Every structure is written in C-alpha cells, then in structure tokens.
C-alpha cells in the first residue's frame, strides 16, 4: 500500500475531534484498513506577561496558554482515493496535511 | 463537605416532589436517578443534590419535612 498519513492539527479541541471522527467515518465506507487515529501530545504555549502597562502596583502577572491539538491517521489507500476521503468542507481552524510514508 | 447551597437544596426538594417513588436511602442509586431527572452540566452539583435528597428521605421516614409539598 501507499500508506498515506493525514495530519489533523487544530487549536480547538471540539473541532479536531469533529474532523477526525468524520474523516474516519468516511474511510470505513471504502474498507481502507486504517491504522487508528492517535492523539499526539497537546502542546501548550505560555506567554506570561505583566498585567500592568505602567510600572507600579503589586507585580502581578498573567499566564496565557494556547493548546495545539494534534492527530495523525495512517491509511493504505491510493493517492486519489485518499483525496476522496479528504475532500469535504471542514470546520474553520483545522489544518489537514497529506503525507506519503517511507 | 460543608453546608449545601440553596441551589443544591431547592433542587433537591424538587427531586423529592416529582420523584419520591423512585428514591430510597442509598446514595449510589439516587445519583443515577438524578442524572436522568436533572439537566445540569456539573457532576459536582449532582453529587450534592443526591446527598441532600438521601438526607431528606431519611427525614421522611421519621415524619414531615417543612417545605416538602408531597401532596
């Protein structure tokens, strides 16, 4: 097989599962023999600034976070069958990436 | 593990009114009813509602409870 790996990355946790479970529910209809969607570790991104724009006060801070959700799916279909699985209008803010393994 | 808020206590009396027959002296079975009869999102409140409901079922075995409106 060609072993195409689709990378589903997103900033929303509810949009990354609504793509991946939808993308997986497409790739059961052609009996593609997928290797199941794995959840790569979510990377949180900290920017811990001061709160004040001036200098005084108690030196208070606020940490901001930004989690990146990351999924991959491996499927053995040919390269225009995986474009049949891929082609559907997704939610905004979810990036999909087609990669061919070896 | 302290005083139950009036959000917990007003809702727990309404479970005893509408669903007196489905409830007994156990926590872990009264909890499973309250997940089907209360549409709230928190599991922390639904644990506290099933605690104060169980308490005012032991009070209804003894006698009358004020504000219970069992009818």
């Amino acid at each position: 097989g060609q072993t195409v790996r689709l990378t589903i990355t997103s900033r929303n946790a509810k949009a990354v599962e609504s793509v991946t479970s939808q993308l997986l529910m497409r790739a059961r209809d052609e009996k593609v023999t997928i290797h199941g969607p794995v959840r790569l570790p979510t990377r949180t991104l900290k920017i811990t600034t001061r709160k004040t724009p001036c200098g005084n006060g108690t030196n208070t801070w606020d940490t901001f976070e930004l989690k990146i959700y990351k999924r991959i799916i491996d499927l053995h279909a040919p390269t225009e069958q995986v474009k049949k699985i891929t082609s559907f209008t997704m939610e905004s803010g979810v990036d999909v990436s087609i990669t061919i393994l070896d | 593990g302290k005083i139950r808020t009036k959000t917990v206590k007003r809702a727990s009396r309404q479970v005893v009114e509408k669903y007196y027959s489905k409830l007994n002296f156990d926590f872990y079975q009264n909890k499973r009813v309250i997940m089907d009869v209360t549409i709230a999102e928190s599991k922390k409140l639904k644990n506290k509602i099933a605690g104060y409901t169980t308490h005012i079922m032991k009070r209804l075995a003894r006698g009358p409870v004020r504000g219970i409106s069992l009818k």
Binding site: T48, T58, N59, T60, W61, T63 | -
Partner: protein
C-alpha cells in the same frame, strides 16, 4: 511448556518502576540491571529489601523480577521499585495461586507500610508568580 509472567508498576513522585515478574529456576531480582546486592547506598538497599523481607524470603523462591525505573531521582526510585516488587508478588498471586495464600501476605505488606502497595499521591505544587516557590513570598521591606 508454559510462561508464568506478571507486570506491575509503582509510582512515587515521577519515578515509574515497571516490574516484570516471571517464574524462573532461580530468584533473581535486579533493578535496572543491578542485582540488589549492589544497589549502592546501604540505606536504600534496605528499603527495596523490605519488600522481600516483611513477607518472607520463601515467597520469592523461584521468581525472576526485573524492575525498570525511570524518572524522579535517587530516593524516589527506591520507593517506586520496592512498591513495584511488593505489588509484583501479589499480582503474581492474584493469578497462579489461590486467595487464601494471598491476602495474608497482602496484609503483611499493609501492616508494615501502606506505601508498599497503594501509592504516595504527593506531587510538587506549582510555583506561582510573586513567590519564590509554591509558598514563600517575595520579601516585603516597608522602608
């Protein structure tokens, strides 16, 4: 003609010790490949030995135990190992032996120290802003 094998784990702070307990011709317990006569401080070799000693040497008679620990530094890898061994004996007696022979030797572990079996749930508390640590604040001066 058979393979009698049991894997257990122990955690203390960040040290996760996985003990693969299997049946062999000889008892051979080694933590990360060091044969438990050679764990270097005599203090910490005695905490890993009281997984074996409070219950008896007879119960580890023909058991090859391999304890692979990672994380968490020197002292936490002894409490992770001695829990992975003491849980490792009992989960070898959950299968392969009856309940009467276990649950006496489970309670010999529980009577001695509660952390031979369960876990110590304590983790580091996060540092906060305005504080040098979890709790100690910056020094106030007034003048």
């Amino acid at each position: 003609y058979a393979l009698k094998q049991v894997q257990t784990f122990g955690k203390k702070k960040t040290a996760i010790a996985v003990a693969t307990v299997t049946k062999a011709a000889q008892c051979n317990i080694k933590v990360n490949g060091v044969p438990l006569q050679q764990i270097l401080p005599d203090t910490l070799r005695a905490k890993i030995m009281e997984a074996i000693t409070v219950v008896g040497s007879k119960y580890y008679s023909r058991l090859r135990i391999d304890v692979a620990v990672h994380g968490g530094g020197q002292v936490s890898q002894a409490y992770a190992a001695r829990q992975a061994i003491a849980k490792g004996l009992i989960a070898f007696f959950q299968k392969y032996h009856n309940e009467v022979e276990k649950a006496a030797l489970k309670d010999k572990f529980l009577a001695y120290d509660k952390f031979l079996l369960i876990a110590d749930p304590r983790r580091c508390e996060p540092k906060k802003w305005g504080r040098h640590s979890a709790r100690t604040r910056f020094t106030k001066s007034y003048r």
